[PDB]
Symmetry: D2
Subunit: 113 residues, 4 copies
């Protein structure tokens, strides 16, 4: 199945947070309606936090893309709703051979405020 693709509520602001656990530099792009809207990059094996950016969901079509060594990483993803209110969309990724799926971890959350 496709992974890293989520349908958000339309026209909502959401946060994107990235953690890295890799020796290879990670490059994360968030697409909204097939257009690039947020970029992150970094490297480190200590759950290193690349920060959070807030962007708008447009029609709702959000895709997470993660590249390392020039290749798009293998993605795994899920969406969780807590208390019928807090939404988290999570992406793990694998850039190599050890199948740890933590090389970049991308977390989307909404609503904010």
């Amino acid at each position: 199945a496709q992974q890293g693709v989520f349908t958000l509520p339309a026209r909502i602001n959401f946060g994107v947070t990235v953690l890295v656990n890799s020796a290879a530099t990670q490059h994360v792009e968030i697409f909204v309606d097939n257009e690039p809207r947020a970029a992150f990059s970094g490297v480190g094996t200590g759950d290193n936090n690349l920060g959070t950016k807030v962007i708008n969901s447009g029609s709702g079509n959000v895709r997470v893309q993660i590249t390392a060594n020039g290749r798009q990483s293998d993605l795994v993803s899920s969406q969780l709703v807590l208390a019928n209110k807090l939404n988290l969309a999570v992406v793990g990724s694998e850039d190599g051979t050890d199948m740890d799926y933590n090389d970049s971890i991308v977390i989307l959350n909404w609503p904010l405020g």
Copy 2:
């Protein structure tokens, strides 16, 4: 039910990341085996990222507590495993009356590296 309580693998390094969406200052405490082992404080309504800390799980008994206004916030939590490998333990919290459950969001993840 109790919320914000997780059993991790023993003696594992794990990351704790905190996001806030609040006007009241948030205080997050992470306990390992009932001992206070990580703290975060901050405020802001736009998904303010308070960073990530890496700590060890001890016997495995990890608990998240969140306060604001000198009072414990109401917690909701779940654990997710992706690719049979990437673990996320998520806590949402409510400090007030609007039931948005985003006032502090605490993410635990393992394994690292």
Copy 3:
């Protein structure tokens, strides 16, 4: 937080499946827009399957209620989305003192077909 309450897409058919793991007889009622729409009951400690019923979500306001020994059980719940398509809303419940939260397990899924 309230547990066992989910917002479904409006006017959608969804399935409700119940498993029991209890010595006490379990009584499950599913409410849609505050009206009773599906009932299940049974007893057994072997993950005993009470079957599946398909009902309609109305405005979308769905609540799971679980009673044993005349008392509403303590609920825990979450919603999961897989492949940006398959939705599962899960409720565990505790009727007693052992905190196993399996006494009735209620699974909602959509879309069908």
Copy 4:
């Protein structure tokens, strides 16, 4: 990533429940330590419940395979833990072209009793 593969506690009894939403007959196989240990077959587009079977996890290595039309279906999966106690491992699957991922839905849960 591999999907439908889960590590359970060793030597634990767990339940497997299958729902189908398909016009093609579904065949679900559960492997424990690479040995074929539970089977289900059925068909129907209205969330047809094929029942629950209880089996033992052996060393803990559990795999779900789903076929229809003599071919392995595309799998998507996650594991959820509620109340730090109730485990659900969920598999959705697609046998065709409509990408609804509900053709067989396989739910594993533990602990029982």
